[PDB]
Amino acid sequence: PKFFYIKSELNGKVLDIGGQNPAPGSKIITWDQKKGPTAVNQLWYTDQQGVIRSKLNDFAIDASHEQIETQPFDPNNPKRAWIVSGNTIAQLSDRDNVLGVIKSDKGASAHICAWKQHGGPNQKFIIESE
């Protein structure tokens, strides 16, 4: 159906499932926006409820661990329900908890984590159609 990219207002890169790993527990980083078929690990859709899912495996965004990663959607796990609200990717059950990009300290790709809204561009995103 309808897919889209999630672009960071911090580095202009997009949410990307690292190494195109289809396995659950895979970390989500920001990476240069890719075009064509290969962009599958950078494409997402929203289910009926508006909850974000990956086009690669229909997995949801999960913030149970230190950095966000993919996990099969579970309606009973509050940390796996993320929606689009303006320029923020917010937790469905706690709109005060939103995603943010955190650049690497070792020269690697930036990762993502969830914490209190602080108004910086690191917690702002732009939805871009496929």
Q: Which domains does the chain have, with CATH numbers?
A: 1-130 (2.80.10.50)
Resolution (A): 1.8
Per-residue b or e along 8-28, where b marks 16 or more CB atoms closer than 10 Å to that residue's CB = bebbebbbbbbeeeeeeebbb
Q: Where are the beta strands (DSSP E) in the chain?
A: 4-8, 14-17, 28-31, 44-46, 52-54, 60-62, 69-71, 82-85, 88-91, 94-102, 111-116, 125-129
